[PDB]
Each structure stands twice: as structure tokens, then as C-alpha cells.
Design an enzyme around this catalytic site. Structure first.
Site, PDB file in Angstrom:
ATOM      1  N   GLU A 159      -1.634  43.256 -23.699  1.00 31.77           N
ATOM      2  CA  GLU A 159      -0.805  42.135 -23.312  1.00 31.77           C
ATOM      3  C   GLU A 159       0.221  41.885 -24.371  1.00 31.77           C
ATOM      4  O   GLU A 159       1.382  41.640 -24.071  1.00 31.77           O
ATOM      5  CB  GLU A 159      -1.622  40.878 -23.084  1.00 31.77           C
ATOM      6  N   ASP A 179      -5.551  32.231 -20.204  1.00 30.16           N
ATOM      7  CA  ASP A 179      -4.934  32.657 -21.454  1.00 30.16           C
ATOM      8  C   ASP A 179      -4.747  31.468 -22.397  1.00 30.16           C
ATOM      9  O   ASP A 179      -4.309  30.405 -21.976  1.00 30.16           O
ATOM     10  CB  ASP A 179      -3.598  33.326 -21.137  1.00 30.16           C
TER      11      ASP A 179
HETATM   12  N1  LIG Z   1       7.669  32.547 -26.470  1.00 30.30           N
HETATM   13  C1  LIG Z   1       7.082  33.646 -27.189  1.00 30.30           C
HETATM   14  N2  LIG Z   1       7.450  34.149 -28.335  1.00 30.30           N
HETATM   15  O1  LIG Z   1       6.609  35.156 -28.616  1.00 30.30           O
HETATM   16  N3  LIG Z   1       5.735  35.243 -27.616  1.00 30.30           N
HETATM   17  O2  LIG Z   1       4.691  36.128 -27.500  1.00 30.30           O
HETATM   18  C2  LIG Z   1       6.005  34.334 -26.761  1.00 30.30           C
HETATM   19  C3  LIG Z   1       5.293  34.089 -25.487  1.00 30.30           C
HETATM   20  O3  LIG Z   1       5.735  33.304 -24.757  1.00 30.30           O
HETATM   21  N4  LIG Z   1       4.121  34.833 -25.181  1.00 30.30           N
HETATM   22  C4  LIG Z   1       3.481  34.593 -23.915  1.00 30.30           C
HETATM   23  C5  LIG Z   1       2.198  33.800 -24.001  1.00 30.30           C
HETATM   24  C6  LIG Z   1       1.070  34.447 -24.748  1.00 30.30           C
HETATM   25  C7  LIG Z   1       1.036  34.840 -26.034  1.00 30.30           C
HETATM   26  N5  LIG Z   1      -0.145  35.336 -26.344  1.00 30.30           N
HETATM   27  C8  LIG Z   1      -0.798  35.267 -25.200  1.00 30.30           C
HETATM   28  N6  LIG Z   1      -0.079  34.726 -24.279  1.00 30.30           N
HETATM   29 ZN   LIG Z   2      -0.842  35.921 -28.173  1.00 31.90          ZN
END
Ligand SMILES: Nc1no[n+]([O-])c1C(=O)NCCc1c[nH]cn1
Ligand SMILES: [Zn+2]
Ligand SMILES: Nc1no[n+]([O-])c1C(=O)NCCc1c[nH]cn1
Ligand SMILES: Nc1no[n+]([O-])c1C(=O)NCCc1c[nH]cn1
Ligand SMILES: Nc1no[n+]([O-])c1C(=O)NCCc1c[nH]cn1
Ligand SMILES: Nc1no[n+]([O-])c1C(=O)NCCc1c[nH]cn1
Ligand SMILES: Nc1no[n+]([O-])c1C(=O)NCCc1c[nH]cn1
Ligand SMILES: [Zn+2]
Ligand SMILES: [Zn+2]
Ligand SMILES: [Zn+2]
Ligand SMILES: [Zn+2]
Ligand SMILES: [Zn+2]
Lengths: 323, 323, 323, 323, 323, 323
Positions: free
Chosen positions: A163, A210
Site C-alpha cells: 500500500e 486503515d
Molecule cells: N496525504 C499524504 N501524504 O503522504 N501520504 O501517504 C498521504 C496519504 O494521504 N496517504 C493515504 C492514507 C494512508 C497512509 N498510510 C495508510 N493510509
Molecule cells: Zn501509512
């Protein structure tokens, strides 16, 4: 077209009733999960690391020990990343795969890669080891009720790999394991022999978990194609509250507030969204305070609210499957 | 990979203490800025106009008169627009460019193009002459404290050209000066001789200022990769309030409310965002009432709140640089 | 628009006459080039290797020792490749850069990367060390005649890095050093201060050399926007033949046959083609027999035909520059 | 990287010698193929038709009756076409799949769709039923020699579905079965457990057959990454001629002329080309006179030249596999 | 689907016979065309110039004076170019538009834009004023025979605007009038009220003329979807030769040689090709010597070969329409 | 550029005054609309169905019976969808088309396609039959006031076809009738003969109505380029409230709350947005509870709030047109 791949727009739940709720709540051990399901996953587990193998193994082992006819499928594939081509391995655990319609729960089991700092490692407790465990506990607590599956509909678990980004969040560096399973599914006859129904058409709803494990989460209602199902979560959280079945819980601090979210969040649902799969996106807004820092560990998890959400989700599932 | 380009995920501020705050507040003259830094910029200055040259000159002249070793670089380039290929000129003022890590402040110095109406011209006081001046005053008020630079980290100012569209807002007509410097930076070895670290990797955080100068702004918290830094702004605004160091300011009207913003706004940060640069986007939501009308002039600026924000930002910078 | 960036559609040569030809032919030493210019380049020199540094150095050193005011510029940049971001370094040697119009000669100095086999290394003698040397010898043999430059037109040499793919030929893995200089040029005011003329507009014609050094080449005529210049090559080859100034040469085996080539070949000219730069693509069709095998070494070069082409090209250049 | 996925750039053939040639020629029965392998395929067989099922079955049945350990895999998938999503089924027959390196032969078994005209149906005898049969006969004639496989290299047959367009040739309506297997292969660890070598890396060379069965074909030499292998075909055709092993054959009418082809032809190799798989594209230029008309039937096939090509290809394969 | 939009794959000509040929040849006056149809078009006529209006007018005027029911339609539209949005005006002249199937002849009537040089203007005699005139003369010479139209098939003339680039040839600067009519056609019900047949489906074959008027042209055979129609041209040229109906013509210098062209040429057919319209591309390879120079004027046209081609094309049309 | 296509950035309303409001309110019959305008549209009307024809007819018939010089134009076109190419038919009703500037109201008249369920059909009462009727009633109630049109500005109605997806919401399956009219407009000279002003430049503001008819809507303020016009709606709703001209209306339940919406919603405005057309997007957030279920019928409409919005919109229009 085929008749059945509409069956979901009109599918409705078998609401459970107080005697039922009390037992689902009785039947989850936050303590069991926390030592049997989650503590083994609080390791560095970026893709290709030995911890990816450990985690993969641990997940299957803890499923296999159950009674229902869980059919596991490791989907090791390859895809391009900054540092080159690399090997990923989605984990897929399915009940009644022959069947046409599946409610799918999902999270990601990889952990973001970080260079050790102060001799500290990123183990990603909310992001997303807890969601992994929450889905294992759900498979256990409901093993019995889930034996009853042999309305042609059943349950699938997906634990995506990759992911996280290796470098910096971008559409090209992200969602390796989801972008790949979306496509493969989209192109697989379902049921076997069909000629127009892909395997998404059997994806009734994608409940993606998540960044769960912190205290005082707030989960927005992200998409109207699934907002009726979000309201069930609110209701299920309310009734479970007024029955004294929740811990350290307050209606003035509910987890599921009817607060809508106009903007977007990138995550393993996009590959399945853009292809019109209905999505319940159980990620909080705002993200945990510890997000993407070494402070996202076990010490900063809140037992009580992982327990409350476990109880809610398990109800939601029995309610969606009529069990 | 190289060790240092992570140094920012873990960088923390040297919080200042009441004796320090009182002096930073003492050391900014809204009146000086308003006559020495901003009034010369309230001219028509679309790209290629004579006012672009005037503004470019004025910006450098007012920097050169300072003591710190500001290294100026005019980056005149060409790019395609509705009416053809045209000449733009980003202005870049850097301290300790040899160094690997920079905190960057930025705005745009071009003004949107408008055909004169009622014998009135668009001078773009909030959009974005004030932000230009706010960054000049910051360079002055802190000249002394910023001499101390000769933790390998320093400060950069970017004044983009061609933020605005010539015709109608679109990804193809917009961000001329940012889309170009993002790319050039992304492809420049940093430090000189590296072989994997671009010049973004030295971009610790991009604090982009835009549409500032109206009363009663509200600034949302846009991205989690930088929300800890947004909270410093709230805190800095609070403490500066409870010390009587702000004017016509009310906590019931704070500027930095913990109101999250799901959706997106297009602006000079995108070229640097999509490449994973951490961003603090100091643009208000809602936009000033006078946005993109001839009424966005000096008469409708509010001295008091430009002064309050000046004071806050200067603290934030000394706090980020440990000064 | 500006007057001069058309000057090339109508530019015509100062045809040389037998006394002149005899001296140009007298003034090239295949033997000097082969020991002074080319043998130092027959090393493994993929991007980032130590041999890239050696070759880069060797090229500049052999230019600097000349008299004309060659202005060298190493353009080290970064760009993305299978194995990650990497550092490249185009070499650019220019005469009279102030000037508006340049005839450009070019090849690539990187060598394809290959894993050692049978304790054999790929040194890429035709692809493209010979073309490198041919351009150095041309700078020498004509040093004197090229002093005369101080019709505002002059000569530029480009030695691209990263022509070759790291893995497998594709638009995304190829032309690293050309795709980058095309863009940078396209966006640079020329002359300095212009506001519509990029640096391509000064690129009168791009003569790109590649895969030269084998016997019995045949060079097709690839593009009509430059076919008049291809005919000069035929003519120059003919007259040089009927004067006894060529070795082991036969008109029944001319190098420049009026055989047209409908299809396409990918190479460092595309970045400059697609932006409408006129191109003479001196790559043979068919490619050398030894193409991309370890057999592309010095033993399989044919002295005589490198000498004949050297002589032809030098005439073509003096003829294009009126010298 | 891994050592072996270079093994092909340096792979050379075990040239057969006149006693061997005479037996390969003895061992092919144009008459057997024509009644046992090809006549069952001269049916309407567009994707989804009953004839696609018939042809699929016929192909496997005629393989299964052989002795070598041919491992068949029907790869029924779905993909989008003008008239909607539809079901395709590539046929893949592999020997020693465990092995790392495969020489691949391929054609397409679908037939273009046409609305019946004058009570006539399109059965696509050259395009591409003959190539199907040629690959079956090759599997038979060489069954014995191909038992010897249990240099880690072996042979794969691919019969793509959906080569043809449903409506009008375009990148979006074409190559359904190839575009899909390229991608799936590109993303499959090979060997199982690798972490950088896809399944293309085991694709030593793709010999794609198409539009074969007419008299007096001329096959151009399309790509240099495989031209050495094209020359083997010329040689093999020559020696087979001077031994009296060919019928109605003339060296003034050879099939493999050293005529190069600058331009491009779209076909099932592109998906594998653009990903850098080496290709021998055995399609003639010009196409048969009967191309895409109802006149592309069995009556207009030329027995003699299908026989001559059968003999040549079988040699080429034994020569590539060292048998 | 609808029955008729296949009618063209099987359409065959009504070959004319020597008495018929002699009259078609009798019925064209190269001298009439040259003074009545072509000399008025040898003016500067880039898009938006006054000469575009003059040429547009001249074309319609010379059609209107004919007897057949030519239905003219000026299709003034707008599209984006380097220098901004601009106004173009395709000219379309149709007979029996009600009808479902049309043979289409086409050229471009714009002339490339050039800055005056030496007080010389680019009038584009081969590129493409002659083709304009050739299509007018064809409408005249065959006016009578073309009255017979009131097999549901007829004739359309298209004179595209904006074929040429304003700056430098590119997919974004080119084919303004073709890219626009392709799309509009592709989206227009034909016949009116259909629900699946666009207006391309009535485009039986696109005979596009371009760069005609020089001596000793050679026209390659570009696409197999139309090569049978190219052979008619060869045949028609042969028989017209052996009847003494051609001037200054030699079979050793035929215009239509069975020389195939692998590569590609960009031109007003691409928009209609990529959407699967069958194309006869009557552009020569190589291009005229005077291509895109001020020397492409009337003095360098060859009367005899424009006359020979006129005669050939007119036969081809009567033969395609059965007249 | 042309003077007038700026006229809209500075256009201001002729606010009506209580005597005027009382009459506009007097002049709308919710009951008339509901039986004369809306009940005929509560039929299945997906694209190509007979109900599309019925609805198309009904819309024009009810316009034609009015007095103003409404100029109707059915724009039947074709475009690609999952199930193939299909026929759509936007309906466009314009007053004073000669004129340069138009205020445009719009909705979609197609209904989403659904397979009958429980013998129930989707008729799409909020989505979007009500908006259709609201625009018809507006044309009636204001017929007289709209006769006064013969400030060069007038009113246009657009009823798009194919708003809805056939299968699953995606950029490729959606907005068929809008994506097509945006482009056609963008490329049409306006006024006729212009050479830089498309037909969007006359699109002063696009007021798009969608998903209206449920109780207790909340309409967010979506774009700043039109937020001043949103405030008029608030004001108009307020004054109409304090005059007793609204039914079952509460200021604590206003419809137009100054709640901003960061995120995005896909709908017929995007094609016109991305090309910089100013948009008022009157779609509610959240969507009706019955959204995309068979429960979106007439029984679940709320008369009172359709009446209140009718009254508000009619004022807004007279106020925008100065009537
Ligand atoms: N804004 C962001 N700036 O960097 N990231 O990754 C971002 C993000 O939105 N990631 C999605 C959510 C997530 C992160 N870890 C698990 N789910
Ligand atoms: Zn993350
Ligand atoms: N929405 C818009 N519609 O048009 N524009 O420009 C828009 C916009 O969002 N611009 C970005 C913010 C801005 C404008 N000026 C400075 N910053
Ligand atoms: N075909 C090819 N297949 O692989 N490559 O590279 C190819 C190619 O065409 N390369 C361009 C010519 C060249 C190679 N080396 C120098 N110039
Ligand atoms: N040109 C074409 N115009 O239409 N098509 O298809 C074309 C084509 O090139 N097809 C590829 C070769 C082929 C056809 N059938 C089998 N192989
Ligand atoms: N190559 C080219 N380089 O520049 N152009 O234009 C080129 C070209 O191919 N143009 C297409 C043919 C043509 C030109 N004029 C009319 N037809
Ligand atoms: N989200 C969605 N998921 O599916 N759709 O369609 C969605 C959607 O947003 N549609 C746009 C609004 C609309 C629907 N009907 C009329 N307007
Ligand atoms: Zn602005
Ligand atoms: Zn090479
Ligand atoms: Zn075919
Ligand atoms: Zn031309
Ligand atoms: Zn809808």
C-alpha cells in the site's frame, strides 16, 4: 445482461436484536486478539523484507486454524517502483469462492519503509497492523456463525501488499497490491464461464480499514453509493452504546458522525472505486496524531476503542450476511 | 540511500519564550513594510509587462540592502501559453545555498492580467503583493538573527512568476513559474555531486503564502504531512495573543482553526506536492471577498491582520531554524 | 515574430573547390585521431561508472588544447530510470555562444551497460566512441579555420549521456541526456533577453552521428526537412571520390545512396525533432553487424571508411559555415 | 541482478548438417497436417462464437495426443471492446515450464468477424489458420526430438485469441489476447520465487507467424535485435534448396530476402516488443492478395510453400534448442 | 448492426473500355483548369488571411456554376494554435448527401505560413493548389456524367483548412481542419436517424491528394486496406498509356509503382485513418524538390503530368461510381 | 482581444423590490407545473428508449406554446459507451441567439438505466425530472417578462442527454451530452464571424440544477468564481422568507447555507468548468435519501420546497437579466 450482479443495490440487512448483540459482544476478546493476532504483526514488514514473509505466514496460520472453509490464495506478483521491479504478495482468504457475490473486508499488511532512526523502527501499529488483527479476530469470533455457509453471498478478506510508497506519495509510487488485484479481478470471468460479469461484479461492497487504533477517531461518510451502509454503522454504534456493551464510549464522542467529506483520500479503494465498486472507507479524518512517525506503536494504541470497533464491525458483517 | 534527506521528518522546533516573542513583535514595523516593501508592488505586473520588470527589480533591491549573504538568482525561462510562447522570470533568494536542507517561503509576484475597466487596473493587493511584502519584511526584521548562518539547514525565498492564468484557470494555463522550477529542481544534483538526492530533497517544507491581506481570514489545515507544523502556527498565534502582542485580535476569530479541508486548491505548491514535498499552504478558505476584482487594492487591506500574521510567521521561521 | 529564426530555411553552402578539398583531405590524420582521440574512449563508460568520468574528462581535455574559443559546459542532471534516480552529464562545447544560430554536431558518449561475459566488456566502438572521436578530430583539423569566428552563425558540439537503455529499449528507458537538453533548450531565451525565441530556434540543423565505424555503411535519407543537406553529402562524397581523395572507396559502394526511409529510428534526435528541429541523421541502415555485441570493438573498425567520412563531414561543415 | 536472463543475447545455434536436414524434411507430412491439423480450423471462429470453442478444443486435443510433456493452460479472461466486455481465451502449451528460458512460437487462432455475404463466411485460412496448423505439425514432426527435454531452455506455443478487431483496426480494438498476456507475464515471478525476473525475461525470442499460406511470400527483416536469427532463416532456406529438399522453390523467389523494413506493422508482438522482447515477425510484406476478403480460403492456399516453410521452421527450432 | 456499412469492402469497379477512355481524355482541358481553376488559387492563403477568403469564395463560385446538385457547406470552426485560438473554414461540396455511401476526394486549400523573403511569397503550387484545381476540373469534366445521380453511393469533395503548421510540424500544430471534421463526422448519425452508423461509415474511401504538380512523381502504395484500389490506378495508367492518351509519359517512369511504404506520413488522412476509414494517399515519395520553399510556384509545375493525372483520376472516379 | 467577453466579471443584478417579489411569487403555480410540466416526465427515459423521445417531445411542445421567441435546436449526436456507439439528443432552447452573452440554466433529462426490479421502474424524480420541470415553469411564469428581449444578454436552456452512466460512474461512462456540447460550443465562432470568441465566451454563468425535489436540501457554495451569485441566492431566500412568500420554510433550515465545499462532484458542469465557464452548481450535499433507488418517485417529492426554489430561481433570473 446477467440478472444477479444487481443484487447488491437492493440488498438489505438482517438487523440483530439485543439478545444477538449481547452475544456478539460477549464473543470478542480484545485480549486474545492483542496477543494472538496483533503482537506478531508489530514488526518491520516492508515489501520483500523478511517481515513481509513472517507476516504473510502469521496471517495464514491464524486463519487455517479456524473451522470455516477459508480458501487462501497468495498472489505474488511483480510491479515497478522507484528502486526497480519488485516482488509483492497480496493475501486473499475467501469463503465460498464458487459463489457469485462477496462482501469484502480489507486492509494492507505492508508497513511503510523508513530508515532506522535513533535505533527505532517503524512497525505501523495503526497503519495498519491493527486493521489486520481486527480482521483476524472477526474471522475467529464469528467462525461458528460463518460455518453456516457450506442468497448466494459470502465473505472475502483481502490483505494488500505494497500500500505504501517507497519514496514519496504519488499515483505511480503507491497501491502496488491494489492496483494489481483490481485489474486482475476486473478481467476474470465470474462466475467461471460467464461472458460479461467480471469478479468486481461479485464485489458487493468493499469495507476498507486503515489507520485504526488511536483514541477518539472520527470516521467521515465518504461516498453516497454506500452511505446507507454508513448509517448502519452509526445505528449499530448507538444501540451498542445504550446497551452498555461499549467501553469508555460517549455519544458525544461517537465514532461515526454524519459529517460528509467532499475531498478525496488515496488508498487501496481507488483501483476498485474508479471501476465502480461500492466502498465504505473506514479511515479516520483526521489521521492519528502518530501518523507516519516512530510513535505509531503498541504503547499508543487504545484497547477500548479497538474493542468497540471490533464489536461494531462484527455486527455489521453478520448483519450484511444475514447471520 | 543518503542519510540526511530524512532529517526533516524528525525535525522539531526551538520554541521561543516570552522574552523572545516580545522582541520579535517589537522588531516588525507594519508601517515600514507598507511604505518601503509593499506600496512599490501595487502596480500592474503581469508577465512581460514593464511592471514585472519593476517588481523584479524592487524585490532584489530591497533584499540586497540587507546584511545576510542572500544569493539572488533570476531564472528567466520560456513556456507556452494561450497567446504563444512567453518569457517568465522566477526570483530566487537563498541563504547558504551550499547547504543541503532549506526551509522555503514562497508566493507569486505576478498579477493576473485584466483588461482595464472603468479606467481601473488590477494590482492584486492580496493576490499576491502583500505576501511578497510579508516575505521581504521577514527578511529584514530577522536580518541580524539570520546573519548567524555564515544542523545544516537554512532559508530560501521563492517569488514565482506566472502563477496566474492568462485566460481561464486550467492545468495548462497556470503555474508557469512553479511547474518549471519544480522540474528543474527535481533534476538538479543536491548537494553538488550527489547521485540520488535532487534539490527537492533539500526542500524541508514549502510554506506558500497567497491571498493574504483581508480581514478575518481563516486558514484550513490542508495536508497531514505538515499538520504538526500547522499546529505550531495555532500555538504561536495563541501565545502571541495572551501576551498582548497582537492587535484587534480575538481568539473567537483566530486565524488558524483546526478545521480540515478534504478538497483541493490549485496553486504553486502542486508541482512540488505531487513530487512529495511537504507543504504548508497559507491561503485562506474562503478567499477574500475582493478576489479577482478591481476592489483588491490597498484601501481594502487590513493593517492589523497583516501585522499579526507577520509577527506569527517570523516566529515560526526562527522556531524552525532554531534562532 | 523575430526576423532571424527563419535564416536557416534559406541558408545555402559555400561549395568548396578542388584546391580547397585537397587541403581538407590533407588536414585530417586518421592515425592521429585513432591514437589521440579514440583509443582513450574504448572503455566501459555507462552512466555513473568511473569510465563516464574518464571519458568526460578526456573529451574536454582534448578540446581545451585547441585554439578556438571553445566554451565547455558540463550539464550534470538527474532523471529516473529502472534502477532509480541517477546522475547524467551531457557535455556541450560551443563556439560563439553569444550568437543566435548554430550548426550542431552530436553523438552519445555513454556506452550501453552489459554484464561482463566470458571476461569481455562492452566498449561500444561504433556505438558510439568513433563518432565521439570523429567530432574531436573535426574540431582539430579545422581549428585554424574555426578561429575566424572571433552571417551570425557558428558551431556547437553535443555529446549526450544516457543515450542507451539500462534494461530494454523503451521511450521511458532511453535518451536520458537528450530528452533533458531538448527541454532545457526549448525553455531558454535565445538570444538572452528574447521573449519568443528559444534555444532551438538557434539550432539550425542537428547532424547526429551514431553507429559509425564499420565497413560498407549505407546511410538513408530520413527527413525531407533536411534532404537538401543530405544531397550535399552525396555530392561531397562524389567529388572527393573523383579527385582520388578517398581510400578503398567505390561509387558502386557509395555511403550516401538516394534510398529513402519511410519508417522511424529512435535516437537522440527525437526530442529535438518532435519540436521541429531539422535533422540529418547519420546512422546507417542496416546497423553494423556487431551491433550490441561484445564484437563491437576496435579490431572490427575499418580505418579507411572512418577516414573517408571524416573528410566528408569536415567539408560539409566548412561548407555550412562558409569557411 | 540475476545471472541467467542475459543467456539469450549470446545464445547460438547448433547448425544441423545435411544428414539431419534430410530427416527433418522426411519427417513432415504436408498432407497429414492439411487434413488432421488445418481442415478442422477452417471454420468461423471469432471470439465467443462456438467456433472459438471448437478451435480451442481441437488445438488441445491434437497436442494431448503427443508424447512430450506438453502442459496446456487455457487463459480465459475478459476485456473491453466496442460492443462491451467480452470473454477471450488464449491457449498456451508449454514444455518444461519449470525452466527459466523459453523459445516461443505464436500465432492467433481467432478469425476476424464479418457479416455473412453472398452466403459466404470468413474462415481466415492465411489469417491465421495455417500458422495454427504449422505450429501443430511442428509439435508432431518433432515430438520425439522434443521428448529429450525431460542449457535450461525449452519451447512454448502461444495461440492468442482476439488478435483481430471487432470493428476497425485501432490500438483500442485489437490485440486483446496479446495485450493481456504480455502484462500478466510481465508481472509474474520467473522463476517462481524470483524477485526481479518477470516471465518475459524467460522469453528468449518471440517467433510470431501470421498471414502464411499464399504463394510467393516475401518476409522482411524487421528488427535488428533479432536479425541474426533472420539470417539463419535465409541460410536454412538456402541449404534446404541446394539439397533438393524443397518443392517448386526458386532462389530467385526466396522467401527471406535481405530487404529491411523501416516502418511498422501492428500485431501480437507489440505488447511484447515495447517491453523489450526480441521478435522475429514472420508476416509477409505485401500481405496475401486475399487478405481480409472471403477469398482467403483453402482453395487459394499453396501446398508447396506451406510445406517449404514448415520444413524451414522446424529446422530453425531444433537449431535454436540444440536438438 | 446495420446491413449497408459493409457495402464497401466488396464494392468493385465498372471498368471502362477504350471508347470510354478516349472520351474522358477528350473531356479534360489542362489549359482550362490552369487558367480558370488554378491560377486564382496561387495566392498567399494561410488561415485567416484575406487569401483564405478569396480561395474559399473562388472554390464555391467555380462549383456553383456547374449543373449537378452540388450542396456546399462551409464549416467555419475554431481551434487552438501556438499563437492562440483561431478561425478555420473547411469547404465541403457534396452530391446526394441524403445517400449513405460516399466516395470522397480531398486536399487542403490552406497554404503554409511564411514570412516574406526577398519580397517573395509562398503560394504553395503543389502544396496544395494544384490538387485543389484537379478536383475542380474533375467536377467539371464529369459534370454531365455526374448529373445522373438525381447502389446508393455518391461523391463528396473536401477541401480542408489548416493542414499546415503555423510553426513547426507536430501533432498539436497540424491538421486543424481534418482533426475537426473527423470528429464531427464520427459523431453524426448517418443516415439521419440511425443509431449506430456515424458519417464515417458512409466514407467508402478517402482519396487524399497532396503535393502534386511536379514532374516525375512516384506514388507509393501505402495501406493494404486500399491496395486493390491502388492497383486500379496502375492499370488505369497503363491502359491510358498504351492508347496514346497520355503526354510525355513513359512506362519506365510510371507514376504508380508497386513499391510499398512501411513508414508513415502525417497528413489529413490520419484523423480518418485511426478511426478505420480506408485511404488512398496520393502524395508522392519523395516530395517535390521545391517542397516548402518559395520555388514551389507555377513556373515549376509540369503541365503534362498534371494532365496525365487528371485523366487517370477522373477515370478512377467514374469507375468507382459506375458511370 | 474582443471587448465584450469580459462583460460578465463585472455584471451586477437589478435587485427586485418587495412589490416585485410579491408578483413573481404570485406568478408561479406549483400545481400547474406538477401536472402540466412534471408528471409527463416521470417515465423511464434512458438514452434511446422510447421515453427519451417522449420526453424530448414533451419538452419542446411545452416551450413552443409560449410566446417568447424560443429557438429550439435538437442536437442528436453519437458517442461511445460500454455497450457500443449510441445516439443521444441534447435539447437546447435559446432566446436571442444572435446575442453575444447568455445566462444558461441546465439540467439533464435522461434517467439512469436500471433493470426492472419487483416490477418497479426508475423514473428519477429528483434526478432529474423536477429540475426539468422547474426550468419549464420558469419559462412560463416569466414568459411575458421574457418577451421584452425582442446590455446584449439573454437566456438559454440546456437539457442534456446522457448525464448518467450506463454501467458504473466513470469519466469514460458519464456526461455524454455535456462533454459533447462543451466541445462543439468551444469551437463555434461567437458571434458569427468572430475569430477568437468561442460560444463559451457568451456563457456568462452556468446554473446547473440536479437532484432537486426532496425536503430539507442544503446547497453548498462550490466555486469562488461564482460565490457572489450564490450569495444573491441566500439573500433572495431570506427576503422571500421575511415577506411570508415561502411555505413551510424556516431560516434555521435555509437552503443556501454559507458552508463551503472543498471537494468535487462530477456532473454536466465539468466539461464547461475545466474550460473556465463560471458555474453555480445547484445540487445538494447530501444527496436525497432516495438517490438512485426506486424510491425516487413522485410520492417522495415535497411540493413546498420545489415551490420555494422555483420562486427563488425565477427571481434570480429576472435579477440577472434586469427584468
Ligand atoms: N496525504 C499524504 N501524504 O503522504 N501520504 O501517504 C498521504 C496519504 O494521504 N496517504 C493515504 C492514507 C494512508 C497512509 N498510510 C495508510 N493510509
Ligand atoms: Zn501509512
Ligand atoms: N477556482 C478558481 N477559479 O479560477 N481560479 O483561478 C481559481 C483558483 O482556484 N485559483 C487558485 C487560487 C489563487 C488565485 N489567485 C491566486 N491564488
Ligand atoms: N530497435 C532497437 N532495439 O533495441 N534498440 O536499442 C533498438 C534501437 O533501435 N536503438 C536505436 C539505435 C541505437 C542503438 N545504439 C545506438 N543507437
Ligand atoms: N493496416 C491495417 N488495416 O487494418 N488492419 O487490420 C491492418 C493491419 O495492419 N493489421 C495487422 C496485420 C494482420 C491482420 N490480420 C492479421 N494480421
Ligand atoms: N516531415 C515533415 N517535416 O515538416 N513537415 O510538414 C513534414 C511533413 O511530413 N508534412 C506532411 C506532408 C505535407 C506537407 N505539406 C503538405 N503535406
Ligand atoms: N459518487 C457517485 N457514485 O456514482 N455516481 O453517479 C456518483 C456521482 O457522484 N454522480 C454525480 C451526481 C449525480 C448523479 N445523478 C445525478 N447527478
Ligand atoms: Zn489570483
Ligand atoms: Zn547502442
Ligand atoms: Zn486479419
Ligand atoms: Zn506543405
Ligand atoms: Zn443520478
Amino acid at each position: 445482461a446477467s440478472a444477479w450482479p444487481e443484487e447488491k443495490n437492493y440488498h438489505q440487512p438482517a438487523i440483530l436484536n439485543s439478545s444477538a448483540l449481547r452475544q456478539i459482544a460477549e464473543g470478542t476478546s480484545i485480549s486474545e486478539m492483542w496477543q494472538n493476532d496483533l503482537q506478531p504483526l508489530l514488526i518491520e514488514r516492508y515489501p520483500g523484507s523478511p517481515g513481509s514473509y513472517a507476516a504473510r505466514q502469521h496471517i495464514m496460520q491464524r486463519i487455517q486454524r479456524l473451522q470455516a472453509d477459508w480458501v487462501l490464495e497468495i498472489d505474488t506478483f511483480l510491479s515497478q517502483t522507484p528502486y526497480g521491479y519488485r516482488s509483492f504478495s497480496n493475501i486473499i482468504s475467501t469463503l465460498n469462492p464458487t459463489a457469485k457475490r462477496h462482501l469484502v473486508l480489507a486492509c494492507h499488511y505492508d508497513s511503510k519503509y523508513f530508515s532506522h532512526w535513533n535505533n527505532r523502527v517503524f512497525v505501523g501499529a495503526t497503519d495498519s497492523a491493527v486493521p489486520c488483527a481486527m480482521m483476524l479476530e472477526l474471522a475467529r469470533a464469528l467462525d461458528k456463525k460463518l460455518l453456516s455457509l457450506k442468497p448466494d453471498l459470502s465473505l472475502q478478506l483481502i490483505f494488500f501488499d505494497g500500500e505504501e510508497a517507497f519514496l514519496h506519495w504519488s499515483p505511480q509510487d503507491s497501491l502496488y497490491g491494489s492496483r494489481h488485484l483490481a485489474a486482475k479481478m476486473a478481467s476474470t470471468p465470474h462466475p467461471p464461464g460467464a461472458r460479461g460479469t467480471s469478479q468486481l461484479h461479485g464485489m458487493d461492497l468493499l469495507v476498507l480499514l486503515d489507520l485504526i487504533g488511536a483514541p477518539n477517531p472520527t470516521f467521515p461518510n465518504f461516498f453516497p453509493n454506500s452511505a446507507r451502509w454508513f448509517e448502519r454503522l452509526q445505528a449499530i454504534e448507538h444501540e451498542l452504546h445504550e446497551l452498555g456493551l461499549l467501553k469508555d464510549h460517549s455519544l458525544e464522542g461517537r465514532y461515526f458522525q454524519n459529517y460528509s467529506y467532499g475531498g478525496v483520500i488515496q488508498d487501496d479503494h481507488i483501483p476498485f472505486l474508479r471501476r465502480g465498486v461500492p466502498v465504505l472507507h473506514l479511515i479516520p479524518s483526521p489521521f492519528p496524531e502518530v501518523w507516519h512517525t516512530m510513535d505509531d506503536n503498541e504503547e499508543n494504541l487504545d484497547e477500548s476503542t479497538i474493542d468497540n470497533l471490533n464489536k461494531i464491525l462484527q455486527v455489521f458483517v453478520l448483519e450484511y450476511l444475514h447471520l
